[PDB]
Symmetry: D2
């Protein structure tokens, strides 16, 4: 009678407490697993981002490398031409300073001087390789500059 | 006489203009090559950074993966135990609700109820795996709960 | 008559040569611009990849940091409990070695010994925090171990 | 007597079992904390790598962008000049095809034709901007080409 009433009351209390404990345990398990899985998905996204960036960076590395090598090649070439030009120009100027008589054709000298001025003033803002072609003419004029 | 004086003046002008053009061309070549080389060194640093990050990310990916798998394993296990417990608890409570006479030992019932309360209240902030061991006792008490 | 025929022939030749030069110049301009634009799109993709990875890495950094701090906290705590336990255990063993008469309750001693064995053998593969709760019982048993 | 001998034996067993359990717990705590700390150091290295790469990538992005804009500018300019040239060339060729009498100076026509050939054959491997200067001469020659 009253023993059964107490049994029912206690069974009810245990039912409620057990379902509370059950929901609590399940929620905490789900939450910690969610934290782990979310950190894992973020690490995976970061690794895939690194892989994509590494591919694009092999690409950009090849581009920047061949560009730098191209510029180095053309720069060394035009520096070599510049040094040959400077050598012969110094030679001729020394010949003028040494000899007391005429050494060079004044027409060719004035033309070469004005050409040098034009070239130097085109070099103020465009690239330096747009000048390489003119370095031929200079050479030519330095070769026909002396009286001969 | 004056022809030689004019030759010297023009040679001087050409010397100065040529060295100006020379320094200008060399400076612009050096500057553009410096831009190319600096962009190349930065691209190389970026590629090496991507490689280092990719290695560290393989590492962190393995760590986060085995952690998530560990949590998933233990969570499924404790969920299975929870479902067995809930099954037998529902069975016993239904037996109480169905029969008009006593069904369970009230001492064991009160002990199991208070244990469930203790467990649910330990689960409020520590992990969920620290509870797995207690799930044994619950099971034991659910097996000796009915009058038999 | 023949002057006009030659004019037509030369105009035709110039038309063809001009369209050839035109297509050549346009193709080379388009190709170099394509190289520049493709390297630019790859650099942009790499930068965006780095940004996404940096965000995901702030996330993973926070996760790994709070996990390491949690483990350090609980490890220092359980190490402190272990050192208190070791202190009292050494104290009691020295009391046994020093006094020629009984010092401890043999029942409690055997129970504590078997509990230590159970605990050490559960620690062979699960975490170390699943043991923290048992460290209470040990303490309790070390406090009621001496004859008093 | 024998009670004390048994007490000593049991104290010895408990000492050894306790130090075994102690070393075991400490080793597992240290190992799991080491795993967490190592994953944390790797995540930190990866984040710092991403930051360095992002800086270098802002740099390379600026470089590649200004290069592409420079090429686009000069390409549109030389395309505009090419289209003006093609317009006047088509106009003159149509005048030749329409009128039954002479239309252009044959000397200028032959010179312009050979210049176009030289230019088209220089464009087989160097850049397309090294040609921009010659596009002036062409224009000039197309303006003095007709009999006037």
């Amino acid at each position: 009678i009253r023993a059964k009433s107490r049994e029912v009351e206690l069974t009810q209390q245990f039912l409620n407490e057990f379902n509370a404990f059950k929901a609590q345990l399940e929620k905490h398990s789900s939450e910690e697993l969610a934290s782990a899985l979310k950190a894992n998905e973020q690490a995976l996204l970061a690794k895939q981002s690194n892989e994509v960036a590494l591919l694009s960076m092999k690409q950009v590395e090849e581009f920047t490398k061949i560009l730098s090598e191209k510029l180095d090649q053309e720069r060394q070439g035009r520096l070599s031409k510049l040094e040959a030009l400077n050598g012969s120009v110094q030679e001729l100027a020394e010949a003028v300073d040494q000899v007391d008589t005429l050494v060079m054709k004044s027409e060719v000298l004035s033309q070469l001087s004005l050409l040098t001025t034009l070239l130097k003033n085109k070099l103020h803002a465009e690239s330096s390789v747009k000048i390489d072609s003119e370095l031929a003419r200079l050479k030519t004029l330095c070769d026909i500059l002396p009286l001969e």
